[PDB]
């Protein structure tokens, strides 16, 4: 019938029906990538996981990191991953969410921004923030892909603590709980991923290894934020220390230890460069988002290195750009104003350098070290 | 205030505020790419354009190509691009859209699927389809980024013709026009892009060259479909002839014409390979969509070539990326219910096991490839 063929879907139905552009694939994929295995540390290996599950975790984690920008006093992020009870919790301190009724939406702010699509504090680009949040989907996406999703946030400013639980893929909502509060602010998101939607039995070794490395990413990309994972503080202090976990004792194909060049250009840019034996490689972050596919921030840095190096071969000489890039392994941690991406998953940052809100001119010292690695 | 900080947006507001994940960047981009310049043909050069504009054109074009799968009797696609009057028209024959009132949505089907977000005939995946349409956004996105968007479609089956216009970024709709019909079905989408949304004054040389090459893509990726541009039939007949327009007079770094290996594995796969001297290059299509960032369909075909060529090299005295670095591959595939990273569909993510078909290059192809210059270069 005509009504069978031509269908209209609600926004909520569309997300569950076509998850890919929202949270990535909901099918099990087997591929190689960086993870953190216990008793091994950060290593590159083949893993079988569901991108979508890894992503709803990421959305909540990045939201926590975003609060450090909202309130620089924030100093900690506590993560809990419990396979047995299928429970994941992301806690952060610093200013909590305003526990008060939104005068326009007629409901308490936390319920609005965690229980309704297209809600955000990042819709006014005049503020030129360097938060990772941008579309107003992230948290609701995690909620929709969870069987139980709880939001607890305490606001001393408003003298109240808010707690409310959603269930059945954000299809049901429990009673909002309000209580007087006069303590240290905090926000804790606790959720039970709907494994049925990901066709999984439980949170296995592979997915956990991915989530743990992601926690290390956060500890390495943020500033003055201690990250705990199941009670254990992650031993990371600065982007440099994080990059070292990847290189530490790795040796060159000849035998010599890989040389690592580093420079924290300014308060918004930090770069590390080493030689690659498998073509161009990049590990990048924008506003604490893991830009796994890279983007303009990577090109911007990588290219000025390439140029310099090419301008050195012109002397000892017709080298192509890609030829030089193939021997490069670059790490970049940047803070970008109002970044744009190809999709909600934010794996590729597309904003033009002219609009970054800052520049990253590598030093002569860095270049000199680069021209001789 | 709390109300100023925490905001809720309607779906339509969100698209205009955050266009990127819907149609790509709305800012100018300068880079080299393949286009079609008149009196030159297909060529690779620096171009300055806005992806979002190029994309709304693409959405309507792929919709036309999709109809060939819906009605194999479809035979033509006619495209008109008039810079002067900022007008673009895309016409196709074959079955028209049912011109009847939708019993649930309370409006004629055409008005529903072109004027309401999240409307599609592709929401049921128990049906294994090879159309490019997937999310039910495409047509509405073009409407939204157009100052004027007209839909005309005729269905002999329902003995009716439908015509209606939308304006002001789908914010307003003119009266619906209905009339008796009993001729050859067709659908024509005519629109005037809202260039202000793309910070443009008019459809310049660069954007036109991209749109024209895109029309050539359609002529080369579809089967049994004649494509016309501004009244002229594009001289393409099969994916092979299409690829030849890129490799026509290309030469080696030494100066000899590059070797081109071709093969139509089956009714759903066609591959062309030659040598590259500027790193791995791929030009691919999935259900007539230009997968500019590639995807599993490209990995699938390229990886088996790499592994095999990687072997012939070992028995003659190597890594993987090193071999792939000298490959220029063209892939035209039909994939069942494909998934992509974004609405723009530049990267196809569906796993090979779910393609609905296989693509094993023949021995005649692998050997002919063994001597195109790749192995020798390594
Ligand atoms: N941990 C937190 N502490 C304080 N505020 C938070 C926290 N997490 C979320 N928020 C608020 O929650 C909102 C939730 O919206 P969310 O769905 O995550 O979209 P977003 O982060 O703004 N943009 P995006 O993630 O790109 O879709 C954010 O905009 C914040 O204002
Ligand atoms: N040229 C055409 N001929 C016949 N039917 C058409 C034509 N163009 C569009 N349609 C119908 O119009 C619908 C419009 O929805 P559209 O926005 O294009 O989404 P879609 O193509 O299904 N999916 P997508 O483009 O990935 O968002 C399609 O689903 C078709 O059923
Ligand atoms: Mg967020
Ligand atoms: Mg479409």
Curated annotation (Swiss-Prot), chain B:
It is found in: Cytoplasm; Nucleus, Nucleoplasm; Nucleus; Nucleus, Nucleolus. Expressed in the tonsil, spleen, lymph node, thymus, skin, pancreas, testis, colon, kidney, liver, brain and lung. Also found in high-grade lymphomas, squamous cell lung tumors and seminomas. ATP binds at residues 63, 92, 120-122, 133-140, 343-345. There is a cross-link at residues 128-129, 233, 319, 353, 364 (Glycyl lysine isopeptide (Lys-Gly) (interchain with G-Cter in SUMO2)). It comes from the Eukaryota. The modification Phosphothreonine is found at residue 254. Disulfide bonds: none annotated. Residues 314-316 are annotated as: Interaction with DNA. Phosphorylation has no effect on catalytic activity. (Microbial infection) Deubiquitinated by Epstein-Barr virus BPLF1; leading to stabilized SUMOylated TOP2A trapped in cleavage complexes, which halts the DNA damage response to TOP2A-induced double-strand DNA breaks. The N-terminus has several structural domains; the ATPase domain (about residues 1-265), the transducer domain (about 266-428) and the toprim domain (455-572). Comparing different structures shows ATP hydrolysis induces domain shifts in the N-terminus that are probably part of the mechanism of DNA cleavage and rejoining. Homodimer. Interacts with COPS5. Interacts with RECQL5; this stimulates DNA decatenation. Interacts with SETMAR; stimulates the topoisomerase activity. Interacts with DHX9; this interaction occurs in a E2 enzyme UBE2I- and RNA-dependent manner, negatively regulates DHX9-mediated double-stranded DNA and RNA duplex helicase activity and stimulates TOP2A-mediated supercoiled DNA relaxation activity. Interacts with HNRNPU (via C-terminus); this interaction protects the topoisomerase TOP2A from degradation and positively regulates the relaxation of supercoiled DNA in a RNA-dependent manner. Eukaryotic topoisomerase I and II can relax both negative and positive supercoils, whereas prokaryotic enzymes relax only negative supercoils. Belongs to the type II topoisomerase family. Key decatenating enzyme that alters DNA topology by binding to two double-stranded DNA molecules, generating a double-stranded break in one of the strands, passing the intact strand through the broken strand, and religating the broken strand. May play a role in regulating the period length of BMAL1 transcriptional oscillation. This is DNA topoisomerase 2-alpha. The lineage of its organism: Eukaryota, Metazoa, Chordata, Craniata, Vertebrata. The chain holds residues 29 to 411 of 1531 of the full protein.
């Amino acid at each position: 019938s005509v009504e069978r063929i031509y269908q209209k879907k609600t926004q909520l139905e569309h997300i569950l029906l076509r998850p890919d552009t929202y949270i990535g694939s909901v099918e099990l994929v087997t591929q190689q990538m960086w993870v953190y295995d216990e008793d091994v540390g950060i290593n590159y290996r083949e893993v079988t996981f569901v991108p979508g599950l890894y992503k709803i975790f990421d959305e909540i984690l990045v939201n926590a990191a975003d609060n450090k920008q909202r309130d620089p006093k924030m100093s900690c992020i506590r993560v809990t991953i419990d396979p047995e009870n299928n429970l994941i919790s992301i806690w952060n301190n610093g200013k909590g969410i305003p526990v008060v009724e939104h005068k326009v939406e007629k409901m308490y702010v936390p319920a609005l921004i965690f229980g309704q699509l297209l809600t955000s504090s990042n819709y006014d680009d005049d503020e030129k923030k360097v938060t990772g949040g941008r579309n107003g989907y992230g948290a609701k996406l995690c909620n929709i892909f969870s069987t139980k999703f709880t939001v607890e946030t305490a606001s001393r400013e408003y003298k109240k603590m808010f707690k409310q639980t959603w269930m059945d893929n954000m299809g049901r909502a429990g009673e909002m709980e309000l209580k007087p509060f006069n303590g240290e602010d905090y926000t804790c998101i606790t959720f039970q991923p709907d494994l049925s939607k990901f066709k999984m039995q439980s949170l296995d070794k592979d997915i956990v290894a991915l989530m743990v490395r992601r926690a290390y990413d956060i500890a390495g990309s943020t500033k003055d934020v201690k990250v705990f994972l199941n009670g254990n503080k992650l031993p990371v202090k600065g982007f440099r220390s994080y990059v070292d976990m990847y290189l530490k004792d790795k040796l060159d194909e000849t035998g010599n230890s890989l040389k690592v060049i580093h420079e924290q250009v300014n308060h918004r840019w930090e770069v590390c460069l080493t030689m690659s034996e498998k073509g161009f490689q990049q590990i990048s972050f924008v506003n604490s988002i893991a830009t796994s596919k890279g983007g303009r921030h990577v090109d911007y840095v990588a290219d000025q290195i390439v140029t310099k190096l090419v301008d050195v071969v012109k002397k000892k000489n017709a080298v192509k750009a890609h030829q030089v890039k193939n021997h490069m392994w670059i790490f970049v941690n940047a803070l970008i104003e109002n970044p744009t991406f190809d999709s909600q998953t934010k794996e590729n940052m597309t904003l033009q350098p002219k609009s970054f809100g800052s520049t990253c001119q590598l030093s002569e010292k860095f270049i000199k070290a680069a021209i001789g690695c």
